[PDB]
Amino acid sequence: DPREVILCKDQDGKIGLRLKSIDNGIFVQLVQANSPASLVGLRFGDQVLQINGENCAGWSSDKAHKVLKQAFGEKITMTIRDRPFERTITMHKDSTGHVGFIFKNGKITSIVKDSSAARNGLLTEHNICEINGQNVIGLKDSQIADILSTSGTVVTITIMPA
Amino acid sequence: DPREVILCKDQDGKIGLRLKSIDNGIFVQLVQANSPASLVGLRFGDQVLQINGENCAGWSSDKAHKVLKQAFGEKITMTIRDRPFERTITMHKDSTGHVGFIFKNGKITSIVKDSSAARNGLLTEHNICEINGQNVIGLKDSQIADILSTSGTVVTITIMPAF
Ligand SMILES: CC(C)[C@H](NC(=O)CCSc1ccc(Cl)cc1)C(=O)O
Ligand SMILES: CC(C)[C@H](NC(=O)CCSc1ccc(Cl)cc1)C(=O)O
């Protein structure tokens, strides 16, 4: 169910967005903290259907970025589909405080045998988006580990295919 | 979220299932019409978490198939997540009766400019699973076209990233 959003460019003329072309669509790759993008609810994995009423279908990442950069005025309109690839998985820490996965560059790379991750069908080649509702996009691997280590027993992660 | 299913092998010793290892999970790639698999509601894109209470995590396609083939007894339990990557998109036919995409082998390959498919952000490298609630997995491309051609103006398609 798409929604329309209005962004007002900041002091530098930016909205705080990086976009990526995938499967002839345009998706939010990065939302800068406290940016116009952040303040209208944009998140990693949001799909951009329209920029200023023009279809993004088949646009390169460069084209989407050029269109945003060239946009005359204070106001940019986007049609957004909320994180359509988003999946949430709930795991429980074992006696050693582990849920049972390895990751690199925010991307899950292996599932530990007979772990909570194994029982719950956690998948590799998926980016970690949130841990217990907290956004981890753009964090270093050691900061993601810090958040997992400081979690209670219940660990809910939001993932998306890389 | 997960559900348990019990299969019995048919007269030929088959359950009517092909499994595929993707991202260190196990997914249903094929369900044969009127198979034991079909009758317990297994579908293309279902995730298999457990076979006979053992985790499928990190299993090769071969291992999953060996485990099923060697399963002692008539009775096989599987823990299933229902088509977890399944997404629905609604489009409207234009004056020519088109929503605006090309597909081959049930996989969307291009989006037509200025179409309902374009406006609604339909994606390529996605398999068509259902049209207007009707399952099209296993149909020939001409049969998928037949269903789209006989649809009313509103076309709701269920898609999934391709294997
Ligand atoms: C942290 C969570 C996922 C923990 N897993 C592990 O410790 C294995 C390695 S992940 C990792 C990768 C890079 C850094 Cl810099 C730190 C850690 C668990 O299984 O519950
Ligand atoms: C059929 C529907 C999806 C129609 N799109 C097209 O006709 C382009 C060609 S797809 C196609 C591929 C194989 C067969 Cl055997 C038949 C058709 C629309 O855009 O509404």
Numbering used by the authors:
A (entry chain B): 111 to 272
B (entry chain A): 111 to 273
The authors write:
Syntenin is a small intracellular scaffold protein that contains two PSD‐95, Discs‐large, ZO‐1 (PDZ) domains that bind SDC, an N‐terminal domain that binds ALIX (via three LYPxL motifs), and a short C‐terminal domain regulating the conformation of the protein and accessibility of its domains (Baietti et al., 2012; Grootjans et al., 1997; Saito, Nishioka, Iwatsuki, Kumagai, & Sasaki, 1975). The PDZ domains of syntenin bind the C‐termini of the SDCs (Grootjans et al., 1997), but bind also to PIP2 (Zimmermann et al., 2002) and several other membrane proteins, including CD63 (Latysheva et al., 2006). In contrast, SDC‐syntenin‐ALIX binding regulates the formation of endosomal intraluminal vesicles and the secretion of CD63+ exosomes that contain syntenin, C‐terminal fragments of the SDCs (SDC‐CTFs) and potential SDC‐cargo such as ligand‐engaged receptors (Baietti et al., 2012).
Molecular modelling studies, relying on the X‐ray structure of C58 and MOE/Pymol tools, suggested that addition of one carbon spacer in the compound structure could maintain both the canonical binding mode and, the face‐to‐face π‐stacking with Phe213, while slightly increasing the distance between the hydrophobic thioether‐chlorophenyl moiety and the polar protein backbone. SyntOFF accordingly inhibited the syntenin‐SDC2 interaction by 96% at 400 µM in HTRF, while the methyl ester intermediate and very close analogue cSyntOFF proved to be inactive. SyntOFF appeared selective for syntenin, not affecting Erbin‐P0071 or GRASP55‐JAM‐B complexes in HTRF.
